[PDB]
A paper describes a structure:
We screened through a number of fungal species and were able to purify a nearly full-length fragment of Rad5 from the yeast K. lactis (KlRad5, containing residues 163–1114) and crystallize it in the absence of DNA. Structures of the mercury-derivatized and native crystals were refined to resolutions of 3.3 Å and 3.6 Å, respectively. Minimal differences were observed between these structures. One native crystal was used for diffraction data collection, data from three mercury-derivatized crystals were merged and presented. The structure revealed an elongated shape of KlRad5 spanning 140 Å in the longest dimension. The HIRAN, Snf2, and RING domains are well resolved in the structure. The HIRAN domain and the two lobes in the Snf2 domain are nearly aligned in a line, the RING domain is located on the side. In contrast, the RING domain has little contact with either the Snf2 or the HIRAN domain. In our structure, motifs I/II have located over 20 Å away from motif VI, suggesting that KlRad5 rests in an ATPase-inactive state in the absence of DNA.
Rad5 possesses a ubiquitin ligase activity and catalyzes the Lys63-linked ubiquitin-chain modification of the proliferating cell nuclear antigen (PCNA). Rad5 also possesses ATP hydrolysis-driven DNA translocase activity, through which it catalyzes the regression of replication forks. The remaining part of ScRad5 contains three distinct domains, including a HIP116 and Rad5 N-terminal (HIRAN) domain, a superfamily 2 (SF2) DNA translocase motor domain of the Snf2 sub-family (Snf2 domain), and a ubiquitin ligase RING domain embedded in the Snf2 domain. These distinct domains endow Rad5 with DNA damage site recognition, replication fork remodeling, and ubiquitin ligase activities.
Numbering used by the authors: 174 to 207, 224 to 293, 311 to 335, 360 to 420, 431 to 444, 454 to 514, 539 to 795, 827 to 1114
């Protein structure tokens, strides 16, 4: 037991009891505990004296609970000589002491730190020295503004296990990841801002250290910090985000400190690294591993669809794999049904969360599932740790289990509340203090030591993606090609090919339209994917699981149980029928031209809106409603959706432009894209052109509006280009069709990129293989050699036309 003075507080007190006897000057008064009311009591008379004001009772009342910790010794000050009448002022000099019981249930611990922190403020002792896009960029401007992060050592793995060449920055991130996991064996060679340093008074060592966030005190300077294996690797996409992480697993693939521990002589998978990855990147991580791993001894395997029967025994067995990749939807699925096969009865050696910002909503089952995973070392690969809210970082901290910020009460007290009340400058300093030793963020805009940017960003990158038509599209393209080949034989047999020059371009145009979509020549459903998910949810809620088997009544034949389940025909209004019974009704109602109504509720059920169950039934999700009649999508629209369904998880907030010369094609695109994509994650904008000037600028207004919770699409005509339209905010473009002149397509692409931007424009050109579109590219390559400009209007003009007509069929 020791004691030491720390400070004094002067305060007037209102008298409570009318003491008549004179009160000594240096009276050793005391504080008794019981809007708040604290009591004054003379130590020798054992009688109450007065009450303290509200602004002082709030400081003293919670400090009395920690008498062993903080002792308050009040002394009397002024001796007017008169008895304390009802209301006379009592002048006190409160002396404060910090006992060794303070020096070295979250609400119990926070109430103590808050009470002591309030005392230090009154003592006045100081140490020795939803989000908007504008508020979010101010956050990055600090958390990415580390003090010269360009001097991190470059660690190189031996090229017997890693067959890729790491960049300058990729070699640095590998060394930092090895340092975060305390893997010194693969490194050459080679405080706590939250803990501040106070000073001792000298009126009644010369320093002492304290952390007023947790209320902890220490004699010496405690440098103990960061008892965490791993961290968060934030980076702009393309800084070797995934490639660097694979370099870590190939460098250290198992717990080396544990193999010797068990060989010296269980639910520890001391050799397996779990990589939770979105399904859109499920096979890419498998591919990126094989493309990078050279050591055949360590193998990776995808865990999807319950392919591995017993995962618990397999991952701690004699030949467990070094990497296991699985979907968040697998973690979320097995977490709900209490699946005890694996993933929750083993402590994996390492866990890596690619695009880990998908657990930002801590209240969803997917987030609760990821935090429930046990591992020795944890990692978070995320290009955007914050999406739309500040507490999105909390789940990233709660996953890493960073004490005491993993506790929600510490976060809401020191981060959420000070931010939500305008004092954002402090909450940013608390966040930046706990994530500084854990997170490492770099930028393609950052410059190196030599004087070059980390990544040379070209203005654009155009890529031609060749597609092959469907089985039905080739027959239409062939039928239109046969008639196109005949109109050439007609004019050529008449002595002059150009006698059908207008008639041939019509057949060529119809060939161009077939490649885009077949509906551009002259039973389509009217239910989007968002509605099918809503109808499936309503359907599973109606026919809920119980003791007995599922039964489905037919509203026509009154059959209590329809068999088989594939013969179940479900209307737009979620009413069950026998598939033959419903078809007989529609055929009878169509042969007499009577409008179709539901035989159960008499509602306008459209024939294309008839639904059926998915065959087979996923036991983890239940019944799924798909269109009874099969829907068709053009090969290019099928390819575009395949790109967009990946950029959705590849990069949030990305604005994309879709080009097409056919105005009707853009109309079909909007209908198909909005139908097959979720509305809360993909926003589609179209440029009709005929709309008023204010609405067209209002569309571009909402399009430029950056939003990391969705991706935005702009469907404008290639014909008009983007003349007078600001398109700088776009990072990706899609050329759904080529044109005769290359200048019109190049000009539209060049209206996107502006020098001084942090992202290159990625362009993809969908060209149907061995089609007229592939021929039109060779025409553009001719116009890039000499131009649309031509000499001669007599013979040279006619001769030039003969070449292009032939090139389309060569
Ligand atoms: Zn029936
Ligand atoms: Zn009905």
């Amino acid at each position: 037991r020791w004691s030491r003075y720390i400070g004094s507080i002067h305060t007037m007190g209102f008298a409570t009891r009318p003491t008549v006897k004179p009160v000594p000057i240096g009276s050793r008064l005391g504080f008794k505990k019981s809007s708040h009311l604290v009591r004054l009591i003379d130590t020798s008379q054992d009688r109450e004296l007065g009450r303290m004001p509200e602004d002082v009772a709030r400081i003293l009342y919670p400090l009395l609970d920690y008498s062993e910790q903080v002792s308050l010794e009040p002394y009397l000050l002024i001796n007017n000589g008169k008895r304390f009448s009802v209301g006379d002022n009592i002048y006190i000099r409160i002396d404060c002491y910090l006992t060794s019981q303070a020096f070295v249930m979250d609400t119990r611990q926070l109430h103590r730190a808050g009470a002591i922190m309030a005392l230090f403020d009154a003592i006045n002792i100081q140490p020795v020295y939803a989000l908007n896009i504008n508020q979010l960029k101010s956050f990055y401007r600090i958390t990415q503004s580390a003090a010269s992060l360009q001097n991190l050592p470059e660690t190189t793995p031996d090229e017997s296990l890693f067959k890729l060449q790491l960049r300058r920055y990729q070699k640095q991130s590998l060394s930092w990841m090895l340092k975060r996991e305390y893997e010194y064996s693969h490194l050459s060679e080679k405080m706590n801002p939250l803990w501040k340093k106070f000073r001792w008074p000298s009126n009644s060592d010369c320093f002492f250290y304290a952390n007023l966030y947790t209320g902890e005190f220490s004699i010496e300077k405690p440098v103990i910090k960061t008892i965490i294996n791993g961290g968060i690797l934030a980076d702009e996409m393309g800084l070797g985000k995934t490639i660097s992480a694979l370099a870590l697993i190939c460098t250290a693939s198992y717990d080396e400190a544990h193999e010797k521990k068990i060989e010296s002589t269980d639910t520890y998978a001391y050799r397996t690294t779990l990589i939770v990855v979105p399904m859109s990147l499920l096979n890419q991580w498998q591919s990126e591993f094989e493309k990078a791993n050279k050591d055949l001894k360590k193998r990776c395997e995808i865990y999807y669809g319950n392919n591995i029967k017993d995962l618990r025994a397999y991952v701690l067995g004699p030949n467990a794999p070094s990497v296991i990749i699985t979907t968040y939807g697998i973690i979320q699925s097995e977490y709900g049904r209490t699946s005890t096969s694996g993933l929750f009865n083993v402590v994996f050696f390492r866990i890596i969360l690619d695009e880990g910002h998908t657990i930002r909503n801590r209240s969803t089952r997917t987030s609760k599932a990821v935090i429930a995973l046990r591992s020795s070392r944890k990692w978070i690969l995320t290009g955007t740790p914050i999406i739309n809210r500040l507490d999105d970082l909390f789940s990233l901290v709660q996953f890493l289990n960073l004490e005491p910020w993993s506790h929600i009460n510490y976060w809401k007290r020191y981060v959420s509340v000070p931010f939500e009340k305008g004092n954002y400058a402090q909450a940013f300093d608390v966040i930046n203090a706990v994530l500084e030793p854990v997170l490492l963020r770099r930028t393609k805009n950052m410059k190196d030591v030599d004087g070059k940017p980390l990544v040379s960003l070209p203005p654009k990158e155009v890529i031609v993606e060749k597609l092959q038509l469907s089985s039905s599209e080739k027959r239409v393209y062939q039928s239109m090609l046969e008639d196109a080949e005949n109109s050439v034989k007609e004019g050529l047999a008449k002595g002059d090919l150009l006698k059908n020059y207008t008639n041939i371009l019509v057949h060529i145009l119809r060939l161009r339209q077939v490649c885009c979509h077949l509906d551009l020549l002259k039973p389509k459903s009217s239910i989007s994917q968002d509605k099918l998910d809503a109808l499936s949810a309503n359907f599973r809620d109606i026919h809920s699981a119980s003791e007995q088997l599922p039964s489905f009544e037919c509203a026509i034949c009154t059959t209590e149980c329809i068999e088989p389940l594939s013969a179940v025909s479900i209307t737009e209004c979620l009413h069950t029928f026998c598939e033959p019974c419903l078809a007989e009704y529609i055929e009878f109602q169509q042969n007499k031209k009577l409008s179709i109504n539901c035989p159960y509720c008499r509602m306008p059920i459209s024939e294309a809106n008839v639904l059926k169950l998915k065959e087979p039934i996923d036991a983890e999700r239940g019944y799924e409603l798909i269109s009874f009649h099969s829907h068709f999508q053009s090969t290019k629209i099928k390819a575009l959706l395949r790109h967009l369904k990946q950029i959705q998880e590849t990069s949030p907030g990305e604005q994309i432009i879709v080009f097409s010369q056919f105005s009707s094609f853009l109309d079909i695109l909007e209908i198909e894209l909005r139908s097959h994509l979720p509305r809360d994650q993909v926003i589609i904008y179209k440029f009709d052109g005929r709309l008023d000037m204010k609405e067209r600028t209002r569309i571009l207004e909402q399009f430029h509006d950056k939003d990391l919770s969705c991706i935005k699409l702009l469907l404008l005509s290639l014909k008009t280009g983007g003349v007078g339209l600001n398109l700088t905010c776009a990072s990706r473009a899609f050329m759904m069709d080529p044109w005769w002149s290359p200048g019109m397509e190049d000009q539209a692409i060049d209206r996107i990129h502006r020098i001084g931007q942090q992202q290159t424009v990625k362009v993809v050109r969908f060209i149907i293989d061995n089609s007229v579109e592939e021929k039109m590219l060779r025409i553009q390559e001719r116009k890039r050699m000499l131009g649309d400009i031509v000499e001669g209007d007599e013979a040279e003009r006619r001769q030039k036309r003969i070449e292009e007509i032939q090139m389309l069929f060569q």
